[PDB]
Amino acid sequence: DWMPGQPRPSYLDGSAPGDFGFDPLRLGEVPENLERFKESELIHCRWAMLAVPGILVPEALGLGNWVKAQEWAALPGGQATYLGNPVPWGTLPTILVIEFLSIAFVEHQRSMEKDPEKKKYPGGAFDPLGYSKDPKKFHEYKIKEVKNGRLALLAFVGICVQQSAYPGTGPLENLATHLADPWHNTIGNVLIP
Amino acid sequence: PPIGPKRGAKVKILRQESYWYKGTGSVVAVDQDPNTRYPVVVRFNKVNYANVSTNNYALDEVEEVK
Amino acid sequence: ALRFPRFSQGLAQDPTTRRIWFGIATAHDFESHDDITEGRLYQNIFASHFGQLAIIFLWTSGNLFHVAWQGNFEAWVQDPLHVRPIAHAIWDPHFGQPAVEAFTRGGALGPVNIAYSGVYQWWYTIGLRTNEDLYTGAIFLLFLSFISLLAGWLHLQPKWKPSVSWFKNAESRLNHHLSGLFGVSSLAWAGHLVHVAIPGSRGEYVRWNNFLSVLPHPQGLGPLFTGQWNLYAQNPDSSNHLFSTSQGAGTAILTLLGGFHPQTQSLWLTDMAHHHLAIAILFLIGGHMYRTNFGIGHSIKYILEAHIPPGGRLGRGHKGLYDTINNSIHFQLGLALASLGVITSLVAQHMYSLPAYAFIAQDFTTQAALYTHHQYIAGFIMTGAFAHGAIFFIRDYNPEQNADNVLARMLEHKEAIISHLSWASLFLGFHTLGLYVHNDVMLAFGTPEKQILIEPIFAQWIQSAHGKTSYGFDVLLSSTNSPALNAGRSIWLPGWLNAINENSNSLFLTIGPGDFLVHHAIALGLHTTTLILVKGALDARGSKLMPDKKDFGYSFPCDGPGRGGTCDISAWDAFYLAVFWMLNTIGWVTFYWHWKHITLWQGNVSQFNESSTYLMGWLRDYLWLNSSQLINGYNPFGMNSLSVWAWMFLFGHLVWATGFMFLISWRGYWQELIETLAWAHERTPLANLIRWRDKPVALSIVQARLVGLVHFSVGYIFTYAAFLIASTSGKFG
Amino acid sequence: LNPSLVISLSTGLSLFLGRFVFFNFQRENVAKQGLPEQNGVTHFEAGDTRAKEYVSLLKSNDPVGFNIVDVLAWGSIGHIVAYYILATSSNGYDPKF
Amino acid sequence: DIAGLTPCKDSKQFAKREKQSIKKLESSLKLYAPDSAPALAINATIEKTKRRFDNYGKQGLLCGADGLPHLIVSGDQRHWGEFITPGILFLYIAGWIGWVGRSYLIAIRDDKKPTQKEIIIDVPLATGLVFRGFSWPIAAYRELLNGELVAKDV
Amino acid sequence: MRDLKTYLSVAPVASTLWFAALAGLLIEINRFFPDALTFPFF
Amino acid sequence: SHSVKIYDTCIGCTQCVRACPTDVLEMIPWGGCKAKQIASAPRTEDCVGCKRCESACPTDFLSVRVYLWHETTRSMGLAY
Ligand code: CLA
Ligand code: CLA
Ligand code: CLA
Ligand code: CLA
Ligand SMILES: CCCCCCCCCCCCCCCC(=O)OC[C@H](COP(=O)(O)OC[C@@H](O)CO)OC(=O)CCCCCCCCCCCCCCC
Ligand SMILES: CC1=C(/C=C/C(C)=C/C=C/C(C)=C/C=C/C=C(C)/C=C/C=C(C)/C=C/C2=C(C)CCCC2(C)C)C(C)(C)CCC1
Ligand SMILES: CC1=C(/C=C/C(C)=C/C=C/C(C)=C\C=C/C=C(C)/C=C/C=C(C)/C=C/C2=C(C)CCCC2(C)C)C(C)(C)CCC1
C-alpha cells in the first residue's frame, strides 16, 4: 500500500503489476481510460529507463553533459561527433528527416494493434530468450520492470529540475559538487537562495 | 383505502410553472372524490407574487420528501 | 390584403393610424408575414443581401465621383501636409454673403466641405494620383452596383431560385469562404500592392495600359520557383526616402521590418504586401478541411458529437449542436454579429496605434473621427449580437433536441451566471466610484498628496516585455540575454524597438494612475452591459414572474399591472435598457482616448497625467476648456467656418432632450388628449368638411420606447460628433 | 539546394507514406466520420442537386484504392514541405545561443 | 526604481509641494492677530501638514514626476503596508460582519413569525452573537469541511 | 418601559444608533492617526 | 380581436367574470372541481385587453389568459 491506513480505490484491488492503490485524483475511474493509462505508463517508464543511462554514461566518459551534447544544432555549421569522431551525416536537417520517418513508422505500427494485452506486453520477436516461460516468474518480472521504471522516471525529472537549477551542468557534476561539501551544497541553497 | 399523501405531510412540488417549484409544502386535504384532476391542497411557508399561500395540485406533481 | 401592408392581414384591418406605423417597422421581419414558407424566407433574404451590396457600391461610387468632380485631390497630392482635402461643394440658397465667404477654403472657388473620412490618404496610399483614376473607379463601381442589382433580380424568379437545402450545406460554404473569399481576395490584394502601389511610392505610374510591360521586381518570378525567396528582400527602401519619389527608393517587394516609414510615420508598404501574402497562404491551406463531393475531409457534425469529456462534467457535450445551428438563422446571425463586433473594435484599436496610410498620423482630426466612428459601430454590433441570441432562444430553440448538452446546461444554472455577473459589476462600481470621489474630495480640500493613486504595474510590465524602457523592469525584449530578444534581433526587433521607444507616436503610450482608474471604469461598463444582455437572453423563455413568456414573442408591452406589475419584462426590453449602457460605455472609452491624445498632440502630457485622477478634472479641463471655439462659431459679432458645428451641437442637444419626452411620459395621457382634439375638430365649421381616413391614436407602448431611444441616441451621436470635430479642427493640433 | 531534387524527394516520400503507412488509418477515419448530414440525412437526400458525390472519378484500378484525390492531397503535402525546406534553407536566418 | 518612481525623501517635486502648501497657509495666516484663535488654528494646520509630509517620507513611499505618492499592489514585499496587510485587515473585518449576520439569520429562522425579528431586532440575541465573528475564520473552515456551509439540494 | 425597549430596537432607530457610534469611532481614530496611506507598523 | 383562454386548473371562483368591464366571460357547468363550475369566454370580439381578469385569478399559475391580437375599433376603445 502506498499509504498504510488509507482506504484503497474500489477499482484498484492489487492484482495489476504495480497497483499499490495510488490514485488520489480518480483519473482511472473509467476502465477504458485505465487500460490506455497502463499502456501509457509502461511506454513512459521504458523511455526513461533507456534514457537515464544515455544521460549518465557519456558524461562519466570523457564527453559533454546531456545538454552540451545537443548544442551544435543551434549553430549554422553544425556537425555532431560520436565518441569524438565527426559524424558524416551529422547536419541537422538530414537527422530531423530520418528521425521523423523511422519513428513515425514504428509508432504507427504500435498504434495498429488491438489486443489489448499485446499493447503493453507483445513479446514474440521482442522476447528472444523467452522469459515468458512461466506465468509466475512472468508476473514477478513485470512487477520488477514497472518498479524500476517508476524509479527511472523519478530520476529523469530530478535530472531536469537540477538542470534548470544549475544551468550548464551535468548530473555527475552535481554529485561531485554535493560530495565536495555535503553539509553545505544541498537543495536548501536553491529553495532559500 | 384513501388516496394520495397523508394529511400534514411534507411534499415537494414538481409543477415547474409554480412559484414554489422544487420547494416544499404541507398537505392539508386530499379530495377523495374522483373526477377532480387536482385533489391535493398544499399550504406553503411563503407567499407568491399574487400574495397567495395555498394551491391545488395533482397527485403526480407532488413527491413525498423526508 | 386589399390595403397596405400586404404582408400582414391583421394590420391591414386596423382602422387607426397604427396601421401605417407598424406597417413600416415590420417590413423586413419575414418570419412574421402571412403565408411564409422556408423557401420564401430564404429567397427573400438572399435577394435582400444583393440589394445591400448594390447599395454599398453606389455609396462608394458617390464618394469617388464627388471628390473627383468638386474636389481637391490633385493639389493635395503635391503637398499632403499643407492643404485641406475637399469633400464636396455647398449650394444652399439660404446662405448669406458672409457665410459664403467663410466656407470658401482649400483653394476652391466657392463654399465647400473639408473631408474627415480619410479617403485622400487611403487612395493616395494605394496608388490613385489624378482625377481620371477617381473617375475610372467611380464608373467601375456604378457597373458593379448594376450587376449586383441584376443578380438580385435573377435569383427571385423560378428557374433560378435555390432550394432550402442548398442554403443548409455548411461544409461547402465554409470551404469556399475560407479558401475563396478570404484567401483569394488577400492574394489579389497582395498583388495590387506589389504591382501598383509599391511602384507608385517609388515614382513610377503603372496602370492598365502598361502593366504587362513593367517588372515588379528586377528578376520577376525567377526566385519564387527556384525556392530562394530571400532575394525579394535584398534591398529595402532606405530610411531617407520621400514617398512618391525615387530619392532613397529600394527594390524589395516583401519585407519584415517592424518600424514605421520615417517620413510618413506609417507602415511600410512591403511589410503589408508580405503580410497579405502570408495570411492568404494560411487561408488557402486552411480552407481544405471539411468534406464535400470528393470523398475526403471532415464532417462537422461528427466533430461536434465526438467532443464529450468522460467524467460527464459537460453532460452530453456538444451532441446535437450542428442541427441547432444549421436550422436557426438567428443563432447564425448572433454568432456573425459577435465575431464582427469584436474585430470591429480590434480595427479601432489597431488603426490608431499602427497607422497604415501615409500622412494620416499627422492629420489628427481624421484619427479622432475614425476611432470614435468605429468604436460606436462596434458597440451597436455587440448589442445586436446579444439581441439575436434572445430571439433565437424564443423562436427557434427546441428543448428536447438539445437534451443535456452545453446549451441546456447554460439554461440550467442561469442563476449562478447572473449572480456572479452581478457581483462583479457591483464590486467594480463601488470601488471605482469610491476612489474617484476620494480623490475629488482630497483635491477640494487642497491636499492632492492624499490621493489614492494605484500604479498599473501589470500593464507597465507587459509594456516592458514588449521592449519599452520607461519603467526599468528588464524582462523579455527588455532584458539583455533572454532568448526572446535573442531570436528576433535580426528580423523585426530593430524596427520594433525603435518605434516602441519613441514617444511621439501612439505605439504603447506611457501610462499612470489615471489610466488605471479609467480602465476599471471601462471594465465596469462592459460587465454591466453584459449582465443586462445576458439576463435578457437567459430569461427570454420564461422566469418565475412570468413562466410562459415564450408564448408571447420577443417583444410585447407588459403583462398588465397584476402580480405586482410587469412593465418592461420582455427580452426586447432588456435590449432597450442595454443600449443606454452601451452608449455610456463607449462614451467613457472615447472620452479617454480623445483627452489623452489631445494633450499628447499639444506637448502637454502632464496636463492629462495630473487632471485625470478626479472627476472635476475631466469636467473642467476637458469638457469646459475645449468648448470655447465651437460655441463661438457664431456670435453677435459674426460667424466663421465653425458655424455649422456650433449649430449642429445645439441640434444634438435638442433632439436628445425630445427623446426624454417619449421616455418619461407614457401613453394614456396622450390618448386622452387626442380624444379631446378629435372632438374639437369634428365640431368646428368649414373644417369638418374635411374628414380623416384613419382615426388618430396615440403611439404604442413599445413604439414609444423605440422612438424615445432613437431620439436619445441620435442626439448623443450628433452632439458628440460636432464637439469632437470642432475641438480638434479648431486647434488642428 | 538543387530545387527539383528536393522537390521530388519530398513529394515521393509524402506519396509513399500516404499509400503504404497511413492509407489504412486514413480510410478508417474517413469511414467512421462519413458524409455530412443535415437533419438526419445527407445533403443530397434533402434535395441538394450539386451535393452528390463524384462516384465516377473516385473509382480506381489501384490494388488498394488509391485514386486521383489521394494523389492530389498527399502530393501537395509533399510540395508544401519541399517549399518550406527550400525557403528556410536559403533564408540566411540565424538565431544565437 | 519600480516603474521609474524615485523615493519621496529623494524627490525634489515632493519637497516643492510641501513648501508651496506650507507658505500658502502662512500667507493666509498673516492676519487677525499674531495670537488670536484663527491664528492658532492656522498654525495647528501648518504643523499637521509638516507631520503628514514627514510621515510619508519615513514610510518609504514612491513618488513620480507629479511629486505625489504612488501605490504598488503587485505583491512586492517592500510595499505590503500599501495594500496587502490593510487588505487582510479588511477581509477579516468583512467576514466578521457577514458571519455574525448569517448566524443571526439562521438563529431566528425557526421562529413562528420570523419577519417580526427582522424588522424588530432581538438585541440580547445579537449581543450573544456579536463576538463569534472573532473566530469566524476557524468556524467557517470547520463548517466548510463539515458539509455545513452550503445549503444542500439547492 | 418594556414597550420602549422594544421600540428602541425597531429597524430605523437601531441603525441610527449603530451608525452614530461607528461614526464616532472612525472620527476619533482619524483624529488620532491622521493622513494614513499605509500600515506603518509591521 | 384578442384571445382569451381558460385552462383546466380553474377552481370556478367566478372572480374573473365579475371583473370584466365588457362582459366577455361567463360561467358554465362542469364536473372537474368542487364548484362544478368553469369559466368560458364566448364574446371575445368585445375584449379591450385590460387583463383585469388576470389580476383576479388566484390559481398558480393563472387559469385565464389574455393574448393580445389584431386590433379593431371595439378593441381599441374608440368613441369616435
Ligand atoms: C449616474 C446614473 C446611474 C448610476 C449611478 C447607475 C448605477 C447602477 N446601475 Mg444603472 N442605469 C442608468 C443610470 C445609472 N445607473 C440609466 C440611465 C439606465 C437606463 C434606464 C440604467 C439602467 C441599468 C440597468 C438595466 C442596470 C443598471 C445597473 C446598475 C448598478 C450596477 C452595479 C454597480 O455598478 O455597483 C454599484 C455602483 C454604484 C454607482 C452605486 C452608487 C450608489 C452608492 C452606493 C451611494 C452610497 C450611498 C451613500 C452611503 C449616501 C446615501 C445617501 C442617503 C440619503 C441615502 C449600479 C448601482 C445594473 C444592476 O442592477 O447591477 C446589478 C442593471 O441591471 N442600470
Ligand atoms: C470561392 C467561391 C465563393 C466566393 C468568392 C463567395 C463569395 C461571397 N459569398 Mg458565397 N457561397 C459559395 C461560394 C463563394 N462565395 C458556395 C459554394 C455557396 C454554397 C454553399 C455559397 C453560399 C453563399 C450564401 C448563401 C451567401 C453567400 C454570400 C457571399 C458574399 C458574402 C458577402 C460579402 O461580400 O462580404 C464580403 C466579405 C469579405 C470581403 C471577406 C471578409 C473580410 C473580413 C471580414 C475583413 C476584411 C479586412 C480588411 C481590413 C477590409 C479592408 C477595409 C478597407 C478596404 C476599407 C460573398 C461575395 C452571401 C451573399 O451572397 O450575399 C449576396 C450569402 O448570402 N454565399
Ligand atoms: C446584419 C445585421 C442585422 C440583420 C440582418 C438584422 C435583421 C433583423 N433584425 Mg436586428 N439588430 C442588429 C442587426 C441586424 N438585424 C443590430 C446591430 C442590432 C442592435 C441595434 C439589432 C437589434 C434588433 C432588435 C431589438 C430587433 C431586431 C429585429 C430584426 C428582424 C426584423 C427587423 C425589421 O425589419 O424591423 C424593422 C426595421 C426598422 C424599424 C428600422 C427603422 C428604425 C431605425 C431604428 C431608425 C434609424 C435611425 C434614423 C432613421 C437615422 C438617423 C436619423 C437622421 C437624422 C440621420 C430582422 C430579421 C427585430 C425583430 O423583429 O425581431 C426578430 C427586433 O425586435 N434587431
Ligand atoms: C426639448 C424637448 C421637448 C420638446 C421640444 C417638447 C415639445 C412639446 N411638448 Mg414636451 N416634454 C418633454 C420635452 C419636450 N417637449 C419632456 C422631457 C417631458 C417629460 C416631462 C415632456 C412632457 C410633455 C407633456 C406632458 C406635454 C408636452 C407638450 C409639448 C408640446 C407643447 C405644444 C407646443 O409648444 O407646440 C410647439 C412645438 C414646439 C415648441 C417644438 C419646436 C418647434 C420647432 C422649432 C418648429 C420647427 C418646424 C420644422 C420646420 C419642421 C419641418 C422639418 C422638416 C424636415 C420635416 C410640444 C410640441 C404638451 C402638449 O402636447 O401641448 C399640447 C403636453 O401636454 N410635453
Ligand atoms: C438601389 C435599389 C435599392 C433596393 C435594393 C433591394 C431590392 C432587391 C431585393 C428585393 C427583394 C424583394 C422581395 C420580394 C418582395 C416583393 O416584391 O413582393 C411584392 C410585395 C408583396 O409582398 P408579399 O405579399 O410578397 O410579402 C411577403 C414578404 O414576407 C416578402 O418580403 O408588394 C410590394 O411591392 C409592396 C411594395 C411596398 C414598397 C415599400 C417602399 C419601401 C421603400 C424602400 C424599398 C427599398 C429601397 C431601399 C433604398 C434605401
Ligand atoms: C446569447 C447567445 C448567443 C450569443 C452569444 C455571444 C454574443 C457571445 C459572445 C462572446 C464574446 C464577445 C467573446 C469574446 C471572446 C474572446 C476570446 C475568447 C479571446 C481570446 C484570445 C486569447 C487567448 C489571446 C491570446 C494571445 C495571443 C493570441 C497572443 C498575444 C497574447 C495573448 C495572450 C493576448 C448565441 C447566439 C451564441 C447562442 C444563444 C445564446
Ligand atoms: C503510374 C504509376 C506509378 C507512378 C506514379 C507517380 C509518378 C506518382 C505521382 C505523383 C505526383 C508527383 C503528384 C504530385 C503533386 C501534387 C500536387 C497536388 C502538388 C502541389 C502543390 C501545391 C498545391 C502548392 C504550391 C505552392 C504554391 C502554388 C505557391 C507557393 C508555394 C506553395 C508550395 C504553397 C508507379 C509506377 C509508381 C506505380 C504504378 C502506377
Find the CATH number of the domain harbouring F32: 1.20.5.510
The three-state DSSP-derived secondary structure of C339-404 is: HHHHHHHHHHHHHHHCCCCCCCCCCHHHHHHHHHHHHHHHHHHHHHHHHHHHHHHHHCCCCHHHCC
Whether G60 contacts chain C with CB within 8 A: no
Residue A144's identity, in one-letter code, is K
Is residue F21 a known part of a binding site?
no
Chain G partners within 8 Å of B18 (Cβ)? 60-61
Whether C489 contacts chain D with CB within 8 A: yes
Number of folded domains that form chain C: 1
Residues 6+ apart with CB under 8 A from C16: C694, C695, C696, C697, G71, G76, G78
Q: For residue A34, how far is the Cα from the chain centroid? A: 20
> Domain residues for E148?
1-154
> Domain residues for D96?
1-97
Chains E and C touch, contact meaning at least 3 pairs of CB atoms under 8 angstroms apart: yes
Residue located nearest, by CA, to atom 35 of ligand 1: C426
Q: Is the CB of C7 under 6 A from ligand 5?
A: yes
The residue assigned the cell 498583388 is C191
- Closest ligand relative to C149 C-alpha: 5
Residue located nearest, by CA, to atom 38 of ligand 1: C429
Residue C211: all three cell numbers together: 502593366
Cβ–Cβ under 8 Å, residues C326 and D38: yes
Chain D partners within 8 Å of A111 (Cβ)? 25
Q: How was this structure determined?
A: cryo-EM
Of A105, A143, A111, A113, residue with least CA distance to A19: A143
Distance linking the first and last C-alpha atoms of chain F: 50
State the Cα angle at C473 between C470 and C476, rounded to 5°: 105
Number of folded domains that form chain F: 1
Total Cβ atoms within 10 A of residue A21: 15
Is residue G57 a known part of a binding site?
yes
Nearest 5°: phi and psi at B30? -125, 100
In Å, how far are C114, C588, C620 from C595, measured between CA atoms? 23, 11, 12
Mutate to test the interface with C, among D38, D50, D96, D97 (most CBs of C within 10 A): D38
Q: Choose the residue to mutate in C661, C669, C676, C707 for probing ligand 4, maximizing ligand atoms within 8 Å of C-beta.
A: C661
Smallest Cα distance from F36 to chain C, Å: 8
Smallest Cα distance from C515 to chain E, Å: 13
Question: From CA C569, how far away is CA C684, in angstroms rounded?
Answer: 43
Determine the topology of domain A31-190 in CATH: Chlorophyll a-b binding protein (1.10.3460)
Give the torsion through C-alpha atoms of C124, C127, C129, C135, to 10 deg. -100
> Domain residues for B4?
1-66
The helix/strand/coil state of E72 is coil
Question: From CA A15, how far away is CA A23, in angstroms rounded?
Answer: 15
> Domain residues for F1?
1-42
The three-state DSSP-derived secondary structure of C148-186 is: HHHHHHHCCCCCCCCCCCCCCCHHHHHHHHHHHHHHHHH
Closest residue, chain F, to C448 (C-alpha): F35
Q: Among the atoms of ligand 2, which is closest to the Cα of residue C180?
A: 1
In Å, how far are A65, A98, D2, D88, E65 from A89, measured between CA atoms? 22, 10, 18, 20, 62
Whether C610 contacts chain E with CB within 8 A: yes
Residue G29's identity, in one-letter code, is P
Q: Which of C548, C563, C564 sits opposite B17 (nearest CB)?
A: C548
Residue C581: all three cell numbers together: 449602457
DSSP state for residue C624 in the 8-state scheme: I
Smallest Cα distance from F39 to chain C, Å: 14
Residue C394's identity, in one-letter code, is I
Whether F35 contacts chain C with CB within 8 A: yes
- Closest ligand relative to C537 C-alpha: 6
Q: Among the atoms of ligand 2, which is closest to the Cα of residue C53?
A: 62
In Å, how far are C518, E18, E70 from E66, measured between CA atoms? 18, 13, 10
Cβ–Cβ under 8 Å, residues C84 and C72: yes
Residue C609: all three cell numbers together: 497625467
Cβ–Cβ under 8 Å, residues C440 and C614: yes
Of C713, C718, C591, C552, residue with least CA distance to C650: C718
Q: How far is the CA of C318 from the centre of ligand 1 (A)?
A: 38
Smallest Cα distance from F34 to chain E, Å: 8
DSSP-derived secondary structure for C503-567? SSS-SS----HHHHHHHHHHHHHHHHHHHHHHHHHHTTT--SS-TTGGGG-S----S-SGGG--T
H helix or E strand, kind and range, residue C707: helix C701-731
Cβ–Cβ under 8 Å, residues C317 and C407: no
Distance linking the first and last C-alpha atoms of chain C: 60
